[PDB]
Amino acid sequence: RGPEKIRPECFELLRVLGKGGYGKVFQVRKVTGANTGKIFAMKVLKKAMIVRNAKDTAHTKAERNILEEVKHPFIVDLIYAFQTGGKLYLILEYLSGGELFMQLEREGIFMEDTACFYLAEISMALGHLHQKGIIYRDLKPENIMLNHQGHVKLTDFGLCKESIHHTFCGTIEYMAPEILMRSGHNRAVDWWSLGALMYDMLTGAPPFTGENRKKTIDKILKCKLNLPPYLTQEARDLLKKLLKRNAASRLGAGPGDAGEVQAHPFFRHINWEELLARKVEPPFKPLLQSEEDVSQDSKFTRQTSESANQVFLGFAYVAPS
Numbered sequence: 001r002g003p004e005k006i007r008p009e010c011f012e013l014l015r016v017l018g019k020g021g022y023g024k025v026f027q028v029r030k031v032t033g034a035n036t037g038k039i040f041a042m043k044v045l046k047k048a049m050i051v052r053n054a055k056d057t058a059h060t061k062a063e064r065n066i067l068e069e070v071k072h073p074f075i076v077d078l079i080y081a082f083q084t085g086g087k088l089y090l091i092l093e094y095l096s097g098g099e100l101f102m103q104l105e106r107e108g109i110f111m112e113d114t115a116c117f118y119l120a121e122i123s124m125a126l127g128h129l130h131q132k133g134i135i136y137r138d139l140k141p142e143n144i145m146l147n148h149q150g151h152v153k154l155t156d157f158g159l160c161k162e163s164i165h166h167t168f169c170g171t172i173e174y175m176a177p178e179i180l181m182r183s184g185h186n187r188a189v190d191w192w193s194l195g196a197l198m199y200d201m202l203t204g205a206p207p208f209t210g211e212n213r214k215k216t217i218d219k220i221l222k223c224k225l226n227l228p229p230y231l232t233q234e235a236r237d238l239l240k241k242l243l244k245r246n247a248a249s250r251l252g253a254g255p256g257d258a259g260e261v262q263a264h265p266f267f268r269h270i271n272w273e274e275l276l277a278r279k280v281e282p283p284f285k286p287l288l289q290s291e292e293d294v295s296q297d298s299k300f301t302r303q304t305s306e307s308a309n310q311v312f313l314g315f316a317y318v319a320p321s
């Protein structure tokens with residue numbers, strides 16, 4: 001006995017949840033120890049092509065550091081981390097609630113009262129990250145997962161889920177103008193992202209789009225905001241204050257940050273203490289018939305100089321409690 005080793009054989013692969021790129025995400029079942037039978041998401045980085053670029057190494061290690069030090073109800077929980085020769089493994093909680101914005105297609109549009117709830121939850125996660133000097137940067141609708149209870153969970157603090165290739169890699173439609181033209185980034189970028197995510201929640205589409213890439217960049221830089229006439233005056237005001245070309249003029253850009261954004265009349269009905277405690281019932285509680293329940297194409301299961309390696313030293317992790 002002693003502490004549990006925790007290597008790849010401790011987990012059996014149930015199915016693919018996503019694949020890059022620099023690796024793949026599996027739904028797994030713990031098969032050894034007192035945890036035997038518990039469902040997790042397992043992130044597997046192909047580590048031999050991460051060390052070939054500094055910025056990718058930076059993100060991989062930042063992630064591993066952030067998921068250890070940062071623990072928040074609206075952020076994905078890291079349970080185990082370990083490495084095997086050529087591979088990096090992150091064991092995280094299986095978020096059986098799937099993508100939040102997958103509900104959009106089903107709902108058509110989210111109502112403000114609904115959108116407000118989830119936005120309040122995202123803003124709380126953003127608040128905590130900024131408190132710890134972390135800025136997300138490219139926050140997309142796809143980054144917002146949901147736990148088993150239907151509450152928000154921020155994911156993807158890692159490298160890039162894309163196979164193509166890192167702004168401009170994948171989809172750019174939710175990124176602040178200052179990130180696009182690559183001229184400095186700060187906390188304000190995340191409040192833009194919040195605005196863009198809000199607009200998508202309430203219109204089913206991102207604020208500015210184009211037929212091609214060049215036109216899309218231009219449409220964002222021009223920042224000609226079109227607001228649908230079905231939006232309340234409070235929602236109209238928040239989007240106008242969140243989506244400004246000038247990052248300084250943006251809401252939350254100042255030292256007030258999240259609390260400032262959270263003070264907007266749009267959130268006037270949110271009990272923040274209850275929200276953070278998750279006592280508030282979420283508008284989409286998913287119904288699950290087992291712990292290993294999937295509702296999110298994915299199908300077909302595989303893998304669970306030289307010595308210049310000092311980068312992922314101390315990579316191994318097991319989470320408190």
Ligand SMILES: CCc1cncnc1N1CCN(Cc2nc3cc(C(F)(F)F)ccc3[nH]2)CC1
Pocket residue numbers: 017018019020021022023024025040041042043044045046076092093094095096145155156158159160161162
């Ligand atoms: C791991 C947390 C999670 C928990 N429960 C259910 N779903 C989850 N996710 C959240 C992350 N998500 C998008 C995604 N990020 C990826 C990163 C990679 C990478 F290897 F980094 F290149 C590969 C595929 C990826 N797919 C789908 C699976």
Ligand SMILES: [Zn+2]
Pocket residue numbers: 160161162164165166169170
């Ligand atoms: Zn990329």
